Design a protein around this ligand. Structure first.
Ligand SMILES: [Mg+2]
Ligand code: NA
Ligand code: NA
Ligand code: NA
Ligand code: NA
Lengths: 409, 204
């Protein structure tokens, strides 16, 4: 607990940009694209106000659009007088991917028509399309093979406080070890993380900070409408914060909270506000109506585990169950606790043989061990129970592929 | 119940079945079969024939059956075992786990075949576990798969009885003969014997 992330002071003009969404649509062969930027303002609405969105590729401005406020008509009462949508054409855009993280820079200028800049906001833009078609998760028209890993924000010395160096160290090791994706298990991460993923090139599953594992049944709160408000806020505020990051390709509703009506509502909410990203959730069976992707945790390759209500079918078998058509990507698999990862090859042989088996995220990146000191002032790695904490689950907090100090297992 | 139509020796296999000039002759082999056996409850599936590749004549006749008799599914293996002329993925000798990616007409492992993007039909091998001589090795692998996968609904072993013929030596003692023992040539010798039982029905 505590103030574990940055605190800051921001100054905005009274007439300001209060929000802005960036989207990129493509033609069939990705040779042409349209960048759409919806901008929202707050403050005194005036006819002289304008918004100019310019798109840069290095030092070269490739596109630009200017327009006054006044969105198109949306219903009987008119439209949003405080909003505007700029549409820019980009020919043969350099596509973004974990393979080649091509980025452009979008500058959003709120200004007076006669040239007075009020304020400017901006973001890195990654031209890429994510969509599920015929049962396959495609990135820019090609089927992805997720070589991912779950990653918690953990430092053996500073706890859950993150820093650029650590984040960079992790990203370098991940890519150096052929990983191309990461799951934000199980909450929205430090803002810098998404920026690093956009630039270094890693696919990201942004996940709402919602886990109620200890409830009985697991969905006791998520199926309760009185908790919908607290839940919707952890989902909606995440989306509103990270929706412009090209690295984020999938939205996740949380982790281990069973499956409740609240999940269906929020799943629909996201599909409605951001149709550019698939939505997944493992709760209640890994294949409920609240997920576009069959995303089981620890489902085996050939062996079934017929648990009542929430069976974990062999992944090969899960795909062809009567009426099933979705792609399957394990949100968690190959638990790396200690001397582990036996049978890893079996997963990758299956992923390569079955088109709809599109990978998974290993559990997990780094042991959650903390540093303590002996009487000689020397440091040693401690786990559950080593701080008087009890009840506790001892060493179960160490399931990483690398030690807390990032030394490889 | 299968129509009497096999043009295996053609090159490519569908040279005649894709030719409208052969549509009439083919249609009678399919239509007169249906008009004859349609009242038998034992017949649960209609087959358009065997190894005649996949031609337009197949799609036409497939639809003809579906139209005159909606009570029975129609199947046909030619052209890849999953063409538009079959309600059932009915491969022959497709393996359980191992793929045989032949060009144009691949035999995917049956477990993989079921989940190919867009595929939803059930899979019943029209032929599998070729029982030629000392065979049926790996048979248990098929059944473990059939039992684990709902859409893998079995298949038909190839085949029931050896196609051997009786010949008599100078003493009048009978012996079992196969291809080429009658001066017949060219011939494919012992390949006519792939049964689970000998010609006299003694089990293998
Ligand atoms: Mg300017
Ligand atoms: Na795959
Ligand atoms: Na753990
Ligand atoms: Na079955
Ligand atoms: Na034969």
């Amino acid at each position: 607990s505590g103030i574990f992330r940055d605190v800051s002071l921001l100054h905005k003009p009274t007439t300001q940009i209060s929000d802005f969404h960036v989207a990129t649509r493509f033609n069939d062969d990705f040779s042409r694209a349209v960048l759409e930027a919806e901008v929202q303002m707050c403050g005194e609405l005036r006819d002289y106000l304008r918004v100019t969105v310019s798109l840069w590729q290095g030092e070269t401005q490739v596109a630009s659009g200017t327009a006054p406020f006044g969105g198109e008509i949306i219903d009987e009462r008119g439209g949003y007088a405080d909003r505007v949508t700029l549409r820019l054409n980009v020919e043969n855009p350099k596509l973004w991917s974990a393979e080649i993280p091509n980025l452009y820079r979008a500058v959003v200028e709120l200004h007076t028509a006669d040239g007075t800049l009020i304020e400017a906001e901006a973001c890195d833009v990654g031209f890429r399309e994510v969509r599920i078609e015929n049962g396959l998760l495609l990135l820019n028209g090609k089927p992805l093979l997720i070589r991912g890993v779950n990653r918690h924000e953990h430092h053996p010395l500073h706890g859950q406080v993150m820093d650029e160096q650590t984040m960079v160290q992790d990203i370098l090791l991940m890519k150096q070890n052929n990983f191309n994706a990461v799951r934000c298990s199980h909450y929205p991460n430090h803002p810098l993380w998404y920026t690093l993923c956009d630039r270094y090139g890693l696919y990201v599953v942004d996940e709402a900070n919602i886990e109620t594992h200890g409830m009985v049944p697991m969905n006791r709160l998520t199926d309760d409408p009185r908790w919908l408000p607290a839940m919707s806020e952890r989902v909606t505020r995440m989306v509103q914060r990270d929706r412009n990051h090209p690295s984020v390709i999938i939205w996740s509703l949380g982790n281990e909270s069973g499956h409740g009506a609240n999940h269906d509502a929020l799943y629909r909410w996201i599909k409605s506000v951001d149709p550019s990203r698939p939505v997944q959730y493992e709760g209640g069976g890994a294949d409920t109506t609240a997920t576009d992707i069959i995303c089981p945790m620890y489902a085996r390759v050939d062996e079934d585990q017929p648990f009542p209500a929430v069976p974990k079918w062999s992944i090969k078998k899960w795909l062809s169950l009567p009426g099933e058509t979705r792609p399957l990507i394990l949100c968690e698999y190959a638990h790396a606790a200690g001397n582990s990862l036996g049978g890893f090859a079996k997963y990758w042989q299956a992923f390569r043989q079955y088109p709809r088996l599109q990978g998974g995220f290993v559990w997990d990146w780094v042991d959650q061990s903390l540093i303590k000191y002996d009487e000689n002032g020397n440091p040693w790695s401690a786990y559950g129970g080593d701080f008087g904490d009890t009840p506790n689950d001892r060493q179960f907090c160490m399931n990483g592929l690398v030690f807390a100090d990032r030394t490889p297992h």
